[PDB]
From Swiss-Prot:
Sorted UniProt keywords: Chromosome, Nucleus
GO cellular component entries: chromosome; nucleus
Predominant localisation class: nucleus
Protein's name according to its UniProt entry: Histone PARylation factor 1
Highest taxon, organism lineage: Eukaryota
Source organism of the structure: Nematostella vectensis
Amino acid sequence: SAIKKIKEMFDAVMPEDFYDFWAFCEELNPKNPEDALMDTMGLQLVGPYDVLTGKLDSYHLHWRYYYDPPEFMTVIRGNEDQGFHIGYYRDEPQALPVFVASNKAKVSCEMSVIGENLFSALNTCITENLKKQQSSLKKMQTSLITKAKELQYSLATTTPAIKARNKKVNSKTLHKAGIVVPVNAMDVGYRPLTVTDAELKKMLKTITESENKSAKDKASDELQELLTFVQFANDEGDYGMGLELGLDLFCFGSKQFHNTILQLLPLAYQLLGREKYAKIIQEHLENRDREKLS
């Protein structure tokens, strides 16, 4: 019913597990469906779910944490010291999400895939809370499993479709969740970075944490050489390279690179027909550390 709401407030269509998960949490907590997971695992529905709860009346930045790339849209918040949260990852603004992933934003840029849908996502969290109160949690585990059975949502952490998409990933990136861009019959559309990911981090750490000066100038020159390679790539149609490098600089997290990122990712997303993600990366870096709550 609020499909139309979310379509105009956010620029997105949510998959059916989004709505089915909500309804699962009404059953649990009719008063506050967004808080049904709180007493047992410290998790609260946020982002697109907030429109249903009433708290919302661009919204690209609503609960976007520090390392959420434009493809990531948060829908559940957890441990605040970790920055633990759960979102839908979406290679293409116009497509549905390809999986659900978690991030501990205060720990790392890295994304953990916990299934195709929020039922499998929650299923993973329930396993861990139970691994390390519990009598009440086991009975939620049971209702989740049967409800997911009914609606035939896989509870698998990696599904055949997730594995199928991983064979189309051009690069895992620093976040390890992968980019997917077209490649035509002449192999145009993507080319790799000329450094490994480990060399890339060593380079960027030198640029940002170093006193040697010549080493910083050297690494700054390597990075400038990368930007020139990206330049040839874009001229030659291999737009995935700039996307990879931009996302990688975003993932490193140094606010020093926001300007380079803004040379890479807005251009990359427009060249790829992913214009909405050019919007989000600009809005996000405009003010990246803040109160996330709206």
